[PDB]
Amino acid sequence: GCEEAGCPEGSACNIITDRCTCSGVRCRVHCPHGFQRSRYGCEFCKCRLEPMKATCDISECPEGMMCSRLTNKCDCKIDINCRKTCPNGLKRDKLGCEYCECRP
Amino acid sequence: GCEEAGCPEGSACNIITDRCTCSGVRCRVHCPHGFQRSRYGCEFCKCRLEPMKATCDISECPEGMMCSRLTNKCDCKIDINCRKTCPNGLKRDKLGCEYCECRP
Ligand SMILES: [Cl-]
Protein backbone atom coordinates (compact mmCIF):
# COMPACT_ATOMS: atom_id res chain seq x y z
CA GLY A 1 0.00 0.00 0.00
CA CYS A 2 1.19 3.44 -1.12
CA GLU A 3 -2.17 5.11 -0.35
CA GLU A 4 -0.58 5.76 3.05
CA ALA A 5 3.18 5.04 2.75
CA GLY A 6 3.65 7.31 -0.24
CA CYS A 7 6.22 6.67 -2.93
CA PRO A 8 9.97 6.86 -3.63
CA GLU A 9 11.05 9.82 -5.75
CA GLY A 10 10.25 9.38 -9.41
CA SER A 11 7.12 7.40 -8.67
CA ALA A 12 3.61 8.01 -7.44
CA CYS A 13 0.79 5.97 -5.99
CA ASN A 14 -1.56 3.99 -8.22
CA ILE A 15 -4.91 4.16 -6.50
CA ILE A 16 -6.13 1.01 -8.17
CA THR A 17 -3.24 -1.35 -7.43
CA ASP A 18 -1.91 0.57 -4.43
CA ARG A 19 1.59 0.13 -5.87
CA CYS A 20 4.01 2.99 -6.78
CA THR A 21 3.96 2.36 -10.50
CA CYS A 22 2.88 5.84 -11.56
CA SER A 23 5.13 8.61 -12.76
CA GLY A 24 3.57 11.30 -10.63
CA VAL A 25 2.13 14.72 -11.47
CA ARG A 26 4.69 16.86 -13.33
CA CYS A 27 3.38 20.03 -11.71
CA ARG A 28 2.49 21.80 -8.47
CA VAL A 29 -0.96 23.08 -9.44
CA HIS A 30 -3.50 23.54 -6.62
CA CYS A 31 -6.60 21.50 -7.52
CA PRO A 32 -9.53 22.07 -5.08
CA HIS A 33 -10.88 18.61 -5.83
CA GLY A 34 -7.58 16.91 -6.55
CA PHE A 35 -6.00 15.62 -9.77
CA GLN A 36 -7.72 13.55 -12.42
CA ARG A 37 -6.52 10.03 -12.90
CA SER A 38 -6.12 7.78 -15.89
CA ARG A 39 -8.57 4.87 -15.90
CA TYR A 40 -5.57 2.67 -14.93
CA GLY A 41 -5.08 4.68 -11.75
CA CYS A 42 -2.39 7.37 -12.16
CA GLU A 43 -2.78 11.11 -11.36
CA PHE A 44 -1.92 13.69 -13.97
CA CYS A 45 -1.85 17.48 -13.88
CA LYS A 46 -5.46 18.36 -14.66
CA CYS A 47 -7.97 19.29 -11.91
CA ARG A 48 -11.09 17.20 -11.23
CA LEU A 49 -14.32 19.04 -11.81
CA GLU A 50 -16.06 17.43 -8.78
CA PRO A 51 -14.84 15.53 -5.67
CA MET A 52 -14.06 11.79 -5.65
CA LYS A 53 -16.34 9.94 -3.22
CA ALA A 54 -14.11 9.66 -0.18
CA THR A 55 -14.68 6.07 0.81
CA CYS A 56 -16.34 2.90 -0.40
CA ASP A 57 -17.29 -0.36 1.32
CA ILE A 58 -18.81 -3.63 -0.05
CA SER A 59 -21.63 -3.38 2.53
CA GLU A 60 -22.89 -0.32 0.59
CA CYS A 61 -22.93 -2.26 -2.62
CA PRO A 62 -25.73 -3.84 -4.67
CA GLU A 63 -25.78 -7.57 -5.23
CA GLY A 64 -23.03 -8.72 -7.62
CA MET A 65 -21.21 -5.36 -7.46
CA MET A 66 -18.16 -4.11 -5.62
CA CYS A 67 -16.33 -0.84 -5.13
CA SER A 68 -14.13 0.72 -7.76
CA ARG A 69 -10.97 2.09 -6.21
CA LEU A 70 -11.02 4.61 -9.05
CA THR A 71 -14.46 6.05 -8.31
CA ASN A 72 -15.20 4.72 -4.77
CA LYS A 73 -18.64 3.74 -6.07
CA CYS A 74 -20.06 0.26 -6.52
CA ASP A 75 -19.19 0.24 -10.20
CA CYS A 76 -17.50 -3.13 -10.75
CA LYS A 77 -18.96 -6.57 -11.27
CA ILE A 78 -17.66 -8.92 -8.56
CA ASP A 79 -17.59 -11.80 -11.05
CA ILE A 80 -16.72 -10.98 -14.66
CA ASN A 81 -16.49 -14.78 -15.35
CA CYS A 82 -13.33 -14.44 -17.35
CA ARG A 83 -10.96 -17.32 -18.03
CA LYS A 84 -8.58 -15.53 -20.40
CA THR A 85 -4.86 -15.58 -20.07
CA CYS A 86 -3.27 -12.29 -21.04
CA PRO A 87 0.41 -11.10 -20.87
CA ASN A 88 -0.63 -7.46 -20.38
CA GLY A 89 -3.49 -8.49 -18.12
CA LEU A 90 -7.12 -7.50 -18.51
CA LYS A 91 -8.51 -4.19 -19.83
CA ARG A 92 -10.12 -1.73 -17.44
CA ASP A 93 -13.06 0.46 -18.40
CA LYS A 94 -13.53 4.17 -17.71
CA LEU A 95 -14.67 3.41 -14.11
CA GLY A 96 -11.42 1.46 -13.56
CA CYS A 97 -13.11 -1.95 -13.61
CA GLU A 98 -11.57 -5.01 -15.21
CA TYR A 99 -13.50 -6.79 -17.89
CA CYS A 100 -12.89 -9.85 -20.00
CA GLU A 101 -10.60 -8.53 -22.76
CA CYS A 102 -6.81 -8.67 -22.85
CA ARG A 103 -4.93 -5.40 -22.85
CA PRO A 104 -3.46 -4.83 -26.32
CA GLY B 1 6.35 20.92 -34.62
CA CYS B 2 5.35 17.41 -33.51
CA GLU B 3 1.63 18.01 -34.21
CA GLU B 4 2.49 16.58 -37.62
CA ALA B 5 5.97 14.98 -37.40
CA GLY B 6 5.09 12.84 -34.40
CA CYS B 7 7.60 11.85 -31.76
CA PRO B 8 10.56 9.53 -31.13
CA GLU B 9 9.75 6.47 -29.01
CA GLY B 10 9.42 7.28 -25.34
CA SER B 11 8.02 10.71 -26.03
CA ALA B 12 4.78 12.25 -27.20
CA CYS B 13 3.64 15.56 -28.62
CA ASN B 14 2.91 18.52 -26.35
CA ILE B 15 0.06 20.34 -28.01
CA ILE B 16 0.92 23.60 -26.34
CA THR B 17 4.63 23.85 -27.15
CA ASP B 18 4.55 21.54 -30.16
CA ARG B 19 7.68 19.85 -28.78
CA CYS B 20 8.01 16.12 -27.89
CA THR B 21 8.39 16.64 -24.18
CA CYS B 22 5.51 14.43 -23.08
CA SER B 23 5.76 10.86 -21.90
CA GLY B 24 2.89 9.58 -23.99
CA VAL B 25 -0.24 7.63 -23.11
CA ARG B 26 0.62 4.39 -21.28
CA CYS B 27 -2.31 2.57 -22.86
CA ARG B 28 -4.11 1.67 -26.07
CA VAL B 29 -7.65 2.62 -25.03
CA HIS B 30 -10.03 3.73 -27.81
CA CYS B 31 -11.36 7.19 -26.87
CA PRO B 32 -14.12 8.44 -29.26
CA HIS B 33 -13.20 12.04 -28.50
CA GLY B 34 -9.51 11.50 -27.85
CA PHE B 35 -7.42 11.62 -24.66
CA GLN B 36 -7.58 14.29 -21.99
CA ARG B 37 -4.55 16.46 -21.55
CA SER B 38 -2.87 18.04 -18.58
CA ARG B 39 -3.17 21.83 -18.55
CA TYR B 40 0.53 21.89 -19.58
CA GLY B 41 -0.29 19.98 -22.76
CA CYS B 42 0.34 16.23 -22.38
CA GLU B 43 -2.16 13.41 -23.15
CA PHE B 44 -2.91 10.80 -20.54
CA CYS B 45 -5.05 7.67 -20.61
CA LYS B 46 -8.49 9.05 -19.76
CA CYS B 47 -11.12 9.76 -22.47
CA ARG B 48 -12.46 13.28 -23.10
CA LEU B 49 -16.15 13.65 -22.46
CA GLU B 50 -16.68 15.99 -25.47
CA PRO B 51 -14.64 16.85 -28.60
CA MET B 52 -11.84 19.44 -28.66
CA LYS B 53 -12.66 22.28 -31.06
CA ALA B 54 -10.74 21.23 -34.14
CA THR B 55 -9.13 24.50 -35.14
CA CYS B 56 -8.63 28.03 -33.92
CA ASP B 57 -7.54 31.25 -35.64
CA ILE B 58 -6.86 34.79 -34.27
CA SER B 59 -9.35 36.23 -36.79
CA GLU B 60 -12.11 34.47 -34.82
CA CYS B 61 -10.97 36.05 -31.61
CA PRO B 62 -12.29 38.95 -29.53
CA GLU B 63 -10.16 42.01 -28.99
CA GLY B 64 -7.21 41.34 -26.65
CA MET B 65 -7.68 37.55 -26.82
CA MET B 66 -5.95 34.77 -28.70
CA CYS B 67 -6.37 31.04 -29.21
CA SER B 68 -5.44 28.48 -26.61
CA ARG B 69 -3.68 25.54 -28.21
CA LEU B 70 -5.14 23.51 -25.35
CA THR B 71 -8.78 24.33 -26.02
CA ASN B 72 -8.68 25.86 -29.56
CA LYS B 73 -10.89 28.65 -28.20
CA CYS B 74 -10.02 32.30 -27.75
CA ASP B 75 -9.23 31.80 -24.09
CA CYS B 76 -5.89 33.56 -23.59
CA LYS B 77 -5.07 37.20 -23.05
CA ILE B 78 -2.70 38.38 -25.81
CA ASP B 79 -0.93 40.67 -23.34
CA ILE B 80 -0.63 39.48 -19.73
CA ASN B 81 1.77 42.43 -19.07
CA CYS B 82 4.18 40.32 -17.12
CA ARG B 83 7.80 41.28 -16.50
CA LYS B 84 8.74 38.43 -14.17
CA THR B 85 11.79 36.31 -14.56
CA CYS B 86 11.19 32.70 -13.59
CA PRO B 87 13.49 29.60 -13.83
CA ASN B 88 10.53 27.25 -14.28
CA GLY B 89 8.76 29.76 -16.49
CA LEU B 90 5.23 31.05 -16.03
CA LYS B 91 2.20 29.16 -14.67
CA ARG B 92 -0.58 28.10 -17.02
CA ASP B 93 -4.23 28.02 -15.99
CA LYS B 94 -6.77 25.27 -16.65
CA LEU B 95 -7.32 26.57 -20.24
CA GLY B 96 -3.56 26.28 -20.86
CA CYS B 97 -2.95 30.04 -20.79
CA GLU B 98 0.11 31.63 -19.24
CA TYR B 99 -0.39 34.18 -16.54
CA CYS B 100 1.92 36.30 -14.46
CA GLU B 101 3.07 33.89 -11.73
CA CYS B 102 6.24 31.79 -11.70
CA ARG B 103 5.87 28.04 -11.72
CA PRO B 104 6.79 26.71 -8.27
CL1 LIG C 1 -6.62 21.83 -14.93
Ligand SMILES: [Cl-]
Ligand atom coordinates in the same frame (compact mmCIF):
# COMPACT_ATOMS: atom_id res chain seq x y z
CL1 LIG D 1 -11.44 6.89 -19.46
